[PDB]
Amino acid sequence: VPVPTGGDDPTKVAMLGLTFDDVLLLPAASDVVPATADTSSQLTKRIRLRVPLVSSAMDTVTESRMAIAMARAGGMGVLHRNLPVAEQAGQVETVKRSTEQFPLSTKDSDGRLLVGAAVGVGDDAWTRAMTLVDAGVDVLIVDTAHAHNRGVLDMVSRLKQAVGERVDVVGGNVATRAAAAALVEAGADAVKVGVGPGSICTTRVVAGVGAPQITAILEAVAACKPYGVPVIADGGLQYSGDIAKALAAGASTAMLGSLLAGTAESPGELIFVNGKQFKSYRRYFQDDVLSEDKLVVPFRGPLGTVIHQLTGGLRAAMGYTGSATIEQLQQAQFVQITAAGLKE
Amino acid sequence: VPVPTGGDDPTKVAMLGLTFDDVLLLPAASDVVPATADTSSQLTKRIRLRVPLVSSAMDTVTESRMAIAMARAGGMGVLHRNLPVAEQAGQVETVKRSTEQFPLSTKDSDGRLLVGAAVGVGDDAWTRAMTLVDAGVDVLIVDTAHAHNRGVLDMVSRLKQAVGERVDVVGGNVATRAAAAALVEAGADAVKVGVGPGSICTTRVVAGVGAPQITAILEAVAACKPYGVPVIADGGLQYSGDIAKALAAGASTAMLGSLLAGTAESPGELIFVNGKQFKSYRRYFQDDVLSEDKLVVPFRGPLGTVIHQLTGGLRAAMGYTGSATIEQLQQAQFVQITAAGLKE
Amino acid sequence: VPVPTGGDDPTKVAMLGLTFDDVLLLPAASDVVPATADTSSQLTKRIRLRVPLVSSAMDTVTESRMAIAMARAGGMGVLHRNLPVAEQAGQVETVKRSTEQFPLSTKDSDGRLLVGAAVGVGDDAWTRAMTLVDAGVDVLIVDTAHAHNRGVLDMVSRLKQAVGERVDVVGGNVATRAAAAALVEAGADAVKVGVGPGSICTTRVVAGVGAPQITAILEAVAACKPYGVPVIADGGLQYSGDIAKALAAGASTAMLGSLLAGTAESPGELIFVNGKQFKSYRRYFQDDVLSEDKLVVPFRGPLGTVIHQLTGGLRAAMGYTGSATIEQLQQAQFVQITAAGLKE
Amino acid sequence: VPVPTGGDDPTKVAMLGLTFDDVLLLPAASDVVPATADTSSQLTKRIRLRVPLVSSAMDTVTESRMAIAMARAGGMGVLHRNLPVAEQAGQVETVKRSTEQFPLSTKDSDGRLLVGAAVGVGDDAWTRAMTLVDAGVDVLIVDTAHAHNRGVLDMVSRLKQAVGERVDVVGGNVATRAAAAALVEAGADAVKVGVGPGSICTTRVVAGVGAPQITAILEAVAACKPYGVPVIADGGLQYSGDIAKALAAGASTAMLGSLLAGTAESPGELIFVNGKQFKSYRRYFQDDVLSEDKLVVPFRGPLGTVIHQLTGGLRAAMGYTGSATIEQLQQAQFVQITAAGLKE
Amino acid sequence: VPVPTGGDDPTKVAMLGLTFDDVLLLPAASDVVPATADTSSQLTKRIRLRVPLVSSAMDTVTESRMAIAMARAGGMGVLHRNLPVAEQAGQVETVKRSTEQFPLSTKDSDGRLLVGAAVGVGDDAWTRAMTLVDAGVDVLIVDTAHAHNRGVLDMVSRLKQAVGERVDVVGGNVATRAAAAALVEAGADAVKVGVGPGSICTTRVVAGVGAPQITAILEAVAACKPYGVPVIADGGLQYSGDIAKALAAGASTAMLGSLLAGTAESPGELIFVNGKQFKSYRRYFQDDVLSEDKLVVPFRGPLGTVIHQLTGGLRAAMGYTGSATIEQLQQAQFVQITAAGLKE
């Protein structure tokens, strides 16, 4: 009767959490070559990206330059909200205003580049969202550290009722089936997934709170797939294999954070120090209560090489799993590996 | 028929022991912000602390200054016993004798700072305990390396019969359900949990004896919660998130040991050597036969910063789990992580 | 109802994969000494080797010299295909053209040294295979990074129909029971097993695809043993005991890759740099789309010492397990070890 | 139906092997103080040692000096057999010929120190054994790397029939229940347990053969306890906690190897090199076919300190587990720990 | 005819420069114990200290607290000039306003603590100097990276005219006999010596300019001693013996810079980072063209320990050389040591 791990409640330790390093993609029957594989995926219920990648809403990752360069690559960028409302609307306008050079460009019905913008929760967040919709934005991301909150669901529902006909609303980070179901019910066109996905992330060390990303994606997909809501895996990625694992676990799009922090298209002036290069950037807008920043970059080259490497890894995984589309890749199986398979 | 780990007795390997690094706190539906979360918790059945932290009864950790500081920070200190009875009684009196500076101060009916003292087993222990009770102590920790002993149980019963109306008697270190049940039947007002909780501690290396702390807390709480007896988790803490994990496992209070040894309020002279700072302290009282000393410090800044960081991590965990109170956090669920989740 | 690792599909995580370091060979009742143990084993259904070792079809590993040495040591070499068809046919002829020095030599009906050659898929692959068959090759390895493909299966069937009477056709790398079953139904005379078997190999990092080698061997042998088709374990070997583990898991032969790259008989000029020795080698033929090269040596002494050490370890394992033959060793039992057993 | 680790045979991976680091001793009800605990144990069915330790039959560990010093400590030493028959008999005579200084001395019925001698298998081994029995030895150890052999059982039975009335015969190293049962049936008065117990021992790396020591002791005890045959754990020990774990797993005596290799009482001349000290020793007798030596010391101080430390660890473990005797210690339970509990 | 170092001009390489590590003080006939040695020495022609130590005018070294502590230690402080004039005057007033605690205190005619203030060159420097004189400063240091300049000389002359009767005008950094003679002719009451004195200082690396401190002190003293003008050695110090070497080389007082930067009395908030302590300080006034800043801190305990160590080393040197007074030490001899005397 007593639980082998202690106590009498078998649900106290609810589950065993698997991360990216715990699982591998099992090869399956394949008639797919990497070059012809279709990597297109649903970012929202109405928006299909040519590349299933989205740069994150970080002040070190996505601005108007990064958003434009990402849209021309076939993905999309989400403008961070650590800047004034007028400045964010101006960067939205910069992306919107700005043939063979960029064949994969993701464009709206007017031929203008698609762009996303992040919003918090509150009246300031509401006026920011209305300004960004007035500025011609296409996707509104109600992004927070812990989106299983009444305020976040209320904001998502308010946006979906007010500006839902024109733009698509995305709910912030979740890690459980219940949170994803709540976001789906509130009317989110997409659900962003991941709470403390990194092994030694500040959330795990300081708060003792976390959820391994593979299991979180599996639960959120179980919640969201019946209603057709796409799932965007955000965090815990270290190599191009992790993107393939996240998409095969059920997610529709991957959100790139620290992998794009130091690129040329990322914001910041490039400077030279001690034989190497870094980025320099010479709060009020940091209103997320559970954010990592409350609890407590080296130059990385052009965005094109990083995107090419990640897409090549994705295509190789699709070839190994025999997936002609991302939808078929979401049906791939996993094999769990032991600690002996982790040792270098 | 044979056990998969060897032999024919299925109880030879009683259970699988979880430590702090084995588990993470899952996010849940939350309407709680870390700032307004209440961290009040029971130390004993009668005493409540506004901050669930207690300093360990170690010579390097807790003297009158550390006890006073810990009581002023919202917790409590337990004065060590590696010293003559007169000195310990004088330290108790010093703490007892010594409104906008310390709002969270723990107090007794007379408004004086709450304090605790450790006692052993025996005649010298009995006279020490009686003198401490006369001196005005509030908690007597009958502390041993192994409290599942007839002598310790009899001492707990004798102190409960003699001074149970004045002071609260806390039983020493146990690691199983049966030992905690024995201490509860002995009349203890709280149970201190942990026996070789550290990974490579001396008790595990020299004697081969220990118990992982999460499982030990779960078993002790299974023994104590039906009777309302609080559990004090002692040992194994490395980060602020470990406090949240221990509280969620069922412990009501966490005892702070190695984390407080080098702080300013800890006893010892602060000296400067080789560009660093250390503490100096320029046996007849180490009478415990199973004590770690029988089997065989750097400066760490103010106590206030350590307490503030620990409480910030705990409040972040409460905001993540949707726990308005410590009792709600004790009902939070764990996710067990693999080895891959521990990789830096 | 939910899977303990996430979601609702119990087959999403298909199985737990064991690598070589996960298992050890249990001792058993033995009357066999290592010296008189017989290490003869089937390479294919028709070809038997006196030493169950084969050199990998890699440019850095196997050319005419390495093939000749491997055949003289009791095993066989497989000539790589990263070169024009004329060069590979000439190397096959060189091996074929070239009694107390080499008693264990593997031979054909005419007494010449047995040799193998790798072929791809396609028209150039077909003409390469036909020219190699004319040149006198004995084994054609239809080698790909992913043999669970219609093209590879059709190539195997075509080669079996065309040159099945003269040469033996070995299907390339598979990692599951279903792929091995498909290759067996395609008519393959042996199945090569392993897809990203290394812990941190490029296939696992860039593509997220792989399979632990012990489990992959077990599944492939479950597919092949009822039909008598031998399994060649390829990749993941680090020690001589790994050969014994792979053989006991059901593989009949182990292919030697990275262990043979730096040896004297391996191709390349032996040069001296910085007080050490290395090998030098002063693409149109790397046509495999899923090859490791698309996703992105030190000197090691004579081959004879490496082979002698490997065979000594294997013979010691056979003496420990009471295995007079390789077929008996394939029935040996494993003990699974924890992480603590891997600690240096 | 298919096995989750691969294949269709559920007994292919027979068991999960636990080592010393995998388990800890759970504290139990205790009325035992370390100083009064009885550490006496059965070395054989007729020989009870005052200290449950036996120095190993290694050329770097036990000679006449080490055997005498061990017998005076309350244990016993086993003379190694890597020396001439006449020399081993002479060292037996040296031990036999050579009040308050050594109260714990283990003596025969004549008051002479007890000593053990190792023998191989064969006619040379038989004449050596007869010489050693003629020399007044008390224990004959038929010691081999893999004692589950017809020759070893035949030698044990021959010795038990010929000289069984005077001396006690011990069977060599086993790791399974079947081997221990075979040794018991053949007539062994004690069974030595352990085959490749070390994590990175040569047997595991080279041969891929091994058995974690805790599970091996459990199985061998399950085989030997009903008939009253003592089990001697040999190998895998690194600290005094491991001796307690081995005895609590069911073994009656521990065999000390590398822990005593560099002591003063160990053979060899003490020399000074480069600011430290080592031992110097300025084959025909190495006839064990499966021995570690076939597959491929720093000074450690006085024996008394090492024996005192190991015995103190044992007594502390007995106090924690509440064992008044070694027989009661053999009833202690284990708790299994995860990888997170191994990290320093 | 040619110079052995190149060319035809023997004055191109003027002289060989000796640093502190090049020389050692030779023992001499002595009847002086360190305790009774007198360390009183001239700072300027009019002001005598009891300990010949002065804190440098750096914004990380000397503010009001450091100046007060230095004056109470028997020396004097020189306030940095990197701040508005009013703030520097306020610091001077704070020092001047602020009996057994500080027996060595340096005082003025009115019994207030002595203090110094740094001034630059120019009109703003003129008004700063006048305001500082009004505030009650005792020494004005006309400090520059290169004092052999007509502007610095004219500033010294103007200050010696206007406020020479009241304050002592100390000329800034020189490194040759000619510059020291120019400062003496300008009317400087003391001469500060050192220009790129450190081995790998920024002045030596970026500009290639410098002068070893022992030789520079010797030349400056050759210029100044015939006129009774004291020399302040400023830079190059690493150990307490360097102070004695500088004094014996002819300097009357040593200026303490980097050695006092991290002390408690130095300006800056003491912060705790990564288990250590550092200092924090949460340009228009850096108007010196040749200053080190134009060419391009850890905690150190109390000031008293550093002063005590330096004075103990100096007293030991005085006892070794037979120097009852600092002026006698200025007559001590040196032995030049080779590179072999520097090897650790």
Numbering used by the authors:
A (entry chain F), B (entry chain E), C (entry chain G), D (entry chain H), E (entry chain A): 12 to 109, 223 to 406, 427 to 440, 448 to 495
Sentences from the paper on this structure:
Central to the purine metabolic pathway is inosine-5′-monophosphate dehydrogenase (IMPDH; EC 1.1.1.205), a rate-limiting enzyme catalyzing the NAD+-dependent oxidation of inosine-5′-monophosphate (IMP) to xanthosine 5′-monophosphate (XMP). Most of the IMPDHs share a conserved two-domain architecture consisting of a catalytic domain and a smaller regulatory cystathionine β-synthase (CBS) domain (also known as the Bateman module). The CBS domain serves as an allosteric regulatory module responding to the binding of nucleotide effectors. The enzyme is inhibited by both GTP and (p)ppGpp, which bind to the regulatory CBS domains and, via interactions with basic residues in hinge regions, lock the catalytic core domains in a compressed conformation.
Surprisingly, in our study, the addition of ATP under cryo-EM conditions failed to induce the extended conformation of the MsmIMPDH octamers. The datasets of MsmIMPDH apo and ATP-bound states were homogeneous, yielding only one major 3D class. While the CBS domains in the apo form were not resolved at all, the CBS domains in the ATP-bound form established a defined position with respect to the catalytic core. The apo MsmIMPDH showed a notably increased deuterium uptake in the region of the flap loop, the C-terminus, and the CBS domain relative to the other parts of the protein. The highly dynamic nature of these regions correlates with the drop we observed in the local resolution of the same regions and the absence of the CBS domain in the cryo-EM map in the apo form. We demonstrate that in the apo form of MsmIMPDH, the flap and finger loops, which are constituents of the active site of the catalytic domains, form a packed tetramer–tetramer interface, which brings the two tetramers close together. Thus, the two tetramers adopt predominantly a compressed inactive octameric conformation, that reduces the affinity for substrate IMP.
